[PDB]
């Protein structure tokens, strides 16, 4: 993998903020793309734009063999059994909200539980609220342990035989952790239940293997994988979306329609309502090309030295407290011990540096932490350590600096 | 308006299929795009892609203001009062499906009545079939004219004091017909109704202003009108937005998260939940620009021009039928009378010309119109009347050619 001549296909990070070079360290926010998936997305409305699935004239052939062509190429990257079984959706948030709307809704009865993590992102938290209340059901948290992990004997006590469905990230977008999906999906199914892997943080970073993983649904965003905004997955076991009913209604999804009722069409394009995502989805089969072309292996590997060398150097300053655990994806966040995290974020971007401070969307997970907000760098595959060096250099300097502020003040 | 320099903005009109320079008649089913939209969304993705909504780095903040920028350049286009009333979807059918969950599935109950049309689009159909069996109201027709259009008395008889919603296309995109959508929203209000209109095929074609309709919701798709794929808009009345609850949940949409309960943002961000749509709402925000800089109403007297033009050359050719009124906008469908529209669309497409044969996402539509099938060509502001020459002569030339096919069998 060499980075300088994969840093030359992104052409956003050529340029400077405030005069000095950009330093983007929020692709766990959102990803940069490529000149291969920016150009796909031009060659589509260039050339061959048209509606789908009629194939009665050639642009409209061509526009399908790509949409088509592209769920092709998404089941085989995260190793799905059948296009079947690959629905394009508008985003992960979008994909979890139509398992909590046609499998949860449809599943849960009072007495039933969801089961689901304090560090869960809000898109795998509150489409499991609303489904629970509707139905009368119960939402339980697994616990985490001391750095931010989770303990496979804490899976096992709350998980129960009235668990229906479990639902956890893959990856935390805040401590980094990896979550043990493999063996949570054996514990889900030992006992009678479902499980729902949010795997947005992990597909654009690491090897997805559904087959390996045993989930029965798992919903990914390719604005976080170098692809276009606007579209995302949901993978499920195909019997279970087969006895799933559509979360959306219209036209492509139907097959036949009376003035009352309708069938609805085989999958996956019974879950796909309307004209689809056509371009973005597209896209995000060359981002997926563009990926398996550098290796996930490789990309995973660059992320691990990144984030031992980040951890590190990390510990070099004082009065950083770094949250979550040793072994992580690539992604720190961090406070600063005197300064709020989003004047860190301000300070930061004033010497061209890009991160993000908030809740990063994991509001139970900050009240856990005993924070109200955090500042967080992340890493991909554009990412160096030099880049890595200018944050904790501008980290130490900002600590002086409102020291200093703090110190005239003091005199005054 | 000048076509020939409008058409030299559009590269995809440029090339030839099967030999012969393309004849795209096929806007309907979607449009093509200027290079002042493709060149928006490569602006988007080489200078400026970041998160939105956090606005703490500079990309971050770029993002946003082009994001919340273009939901401003909709707000005038369509002229609503506030950005709150405009919601960013993935197209129309996803925002007639919000409106079918949010609002119908609320206000429904046994004895309440859904009154739709019987040339409704199946995005304008399904959503609402499910909605009344969900809620146990009904569901009701207003019936149509011969000549395909509605009127106002038979709306008067079909909607009453139990309905609680009128669902109707602005424009039919298989009859051209342009419903009294205006006098339409004056009869449902006088009964208690609100009123959902489906803008999909009007908003490319004429200028929209909801407040002189007083539609209380109202429906479009980009891709229908020169923008990016993968986008639409829901427009609502914001005293009627403001008590539905949201359709789907997840970051973004929310403002405090507990573990069991959260409260949601003000709109329009309650309606949005997840990254949202970044690019493709920039590219439809430049569409818009475009077609505003051409003038809608220039747009609208350009198709009424090619409509009037392909009604009399179409009269010109024997065995051909052409479906609904004379005022219509820019779409002919057809059939010829001893040919399957499908064959019809792949001669056509040999010929370089790209129509569409099928049921348009109409059904009931064609069963009233005693046909299993028909072909249908549309117009937009890049189409010329030599286009509309060459499908008459086309079409002139199948008959022919059919004929000859016939009788050299009925020799053999």
């Given at each position: 993998m060499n980075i300088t001549d994969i840093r030359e296909q992104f052409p956003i990070l050529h340029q400077?903020?405030?005069?000095?070079?950009?330093?983007?360290?929020?692709?766990?926010?959102?990803?940069?793309?490529?000149?291969?998936?920016?150009?796909?997305?031009?060659?589509?409305?260039?050339?061959?734009?048209?509606?789908?699935?009629?194939?009665?004239?050639?642009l409209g052939t061509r526009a399908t063999d790509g949409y088509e062509g592209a769920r092709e190429k998404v089941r085989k990257f995260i190793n799905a059994k059948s296009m079947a079984e690959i629905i394009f959706t508008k985003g992960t948030t979008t994909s979890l909200?139509?398992?909590?709307?046609?499998?949860?809704?449809?599943?849960?009865?009072?007495?039933?539980?969801?089961?689901?993590t304090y560090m869960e992102h809000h898109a795998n938290i509150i489409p499991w609220q609303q489904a629970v209340k509707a139905?009368?059901?119960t939402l339980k948290y697994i616990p985490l342990q001391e750095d931010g992990t989770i303990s496979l004997e804490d899976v096992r006590e709350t998980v129960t035989s009235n668990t229906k469905i479990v639902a956890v990230s893959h990856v935390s977008n805040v401590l980094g952790t990896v979550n043990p999906i493999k063996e949570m999906a054996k514990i889900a199914h030992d006992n009678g239940a479902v499980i729902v892997v949010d795997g947005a943080q992990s597909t654009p970073h690491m090897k997805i293997?559904?087959?390996?993983?045993?989930?029965?649904?798992?919903?990914?965003?390719?604005?976080?994988?170098?692809?276009?905004?606007?579209?995302?997955?949901?993978?499920?076991?195909?019997?279970?979306?087969?006895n799933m009913e559509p979360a959306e209604f219209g036209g492509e999804?139907?097959?036949?329609?009376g003035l009352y009722e309708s069938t609805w069409k085989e999958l996956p394009w019974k879950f796909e309502a309307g004209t689809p995502i056509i371009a973005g989805a597209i896209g995000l089969g060359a981002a997926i090309d563009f990926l398996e072309e550098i290796?996930?292996?490789?990309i995973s590997r660059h992320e691990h030295k990144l984030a031992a060398y980040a951890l590190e150097r990390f510990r070099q300053l004082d009065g950083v407290t770094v949250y979550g655990p040793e072994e992580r994806a690539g992604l720190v966040t961090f406070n600063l011990d005197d300064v709020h995290p989003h004047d860190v974020a301000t300070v930061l971007d004033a010497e061209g540096i890009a991160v993000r401070a908030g809740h990063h969307a994991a509001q139970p997970l900050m009240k856990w932490l005993?924070?109200?907000?955090?500042?967080?760098?992340?890493?991909?595959?554009?990412?160096?350590?030099?880049?890595?060096d200018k944050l904790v250099e501008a980290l130490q300097k900002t600590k002086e600096y409102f020291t200093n502020v703090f110190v005239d003040l003091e005199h005054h």
């Amino acid at each position: 993998m060499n980075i300088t001549d994969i840093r030359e296909q992104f052409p956003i990070l050529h340029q400077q903020v405030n005069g000095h070079d950009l330093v983007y360290l929020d692709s766990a926010a959102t990803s940069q793309k490529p000149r291969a998936v920016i150009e796909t997305l031009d060659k589509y409305y260039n050339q061959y734009n048209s509606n789908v699935h009629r194939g009665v004239h050639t642009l409209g052939t061509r526009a399908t063999d790509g949409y088509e062509g592209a769920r092709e190429k998404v089941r085989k990257f995260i190793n799905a059994k059948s296009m079947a079984e690959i629905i394009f959706t508008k985003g992960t948030t979008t994909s979890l909200n139509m398992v909590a709307l046609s499998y949860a809704r449809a599943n849960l009865k009072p007495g039933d539980e969801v089961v689901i993590t304090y560090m869960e992102h809000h898109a795998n938290i509150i489409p499991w609220q609303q489904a629970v209340k509707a139905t009368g059901a119960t939402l339980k948290y697994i616990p985490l342990q001391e750095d931010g992990t989770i303990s496979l004997e804490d899976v096992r006590e709350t998980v129960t035989s009235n668990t229906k469905i479990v639902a956890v990230s893959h990856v935390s977008n805040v401590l980094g952790t990896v979550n043990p999906i493999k063996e949570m999906a054996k514990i889900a199914h030992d006992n009678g239940a479902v499980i729902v892997v949010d795997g947005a943080q992990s597909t654009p970073h690491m090897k997805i293997d559904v087959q390996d993983l045993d989930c029965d649904f798992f919903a990914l965003s390719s604005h976080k994988m170098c692809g276009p905004t606007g579209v995302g997955v949901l993978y499920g076991k195909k019997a279970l979306l087969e006895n799933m009913e559509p979360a959306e209604f219209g036209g492509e999804m139907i097959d036949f329609v009376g003035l009352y009722e309708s069938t609805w069409k085989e999958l996956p394009w019974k879950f796909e309502a309307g004209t689809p995502i056509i371009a973005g989805a597209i896209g995000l089969g060359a981002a997926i090309d563009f990926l398996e072309e550098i290796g996930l292996d490789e990309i995973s590997r660059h992320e691990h030295k990144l984030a031992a060398y980040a951890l590190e150097r990390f510990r070099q300053l004082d009065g950083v407290t770094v949250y979550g655990p040793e072994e992580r994806a690539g992604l720190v966040t961090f406070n600063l011990d005197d300064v709020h995290p989003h004047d860190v974020a301000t300070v930061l971007d004033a010497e061209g540096i890009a991160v993000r401070a908030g809740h990063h969307a994991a509001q139970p997970l900050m009240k856990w932490l005993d924070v109200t907000a955090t500042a967080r760098a992340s890493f991909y595959l554009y990412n160096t350590e030099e880049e890595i060096d200018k944050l904790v250099e501008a980290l130490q300097k900002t600590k002086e600096y409102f020291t200093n502020v703090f110190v005239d003040l003091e005199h005054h």
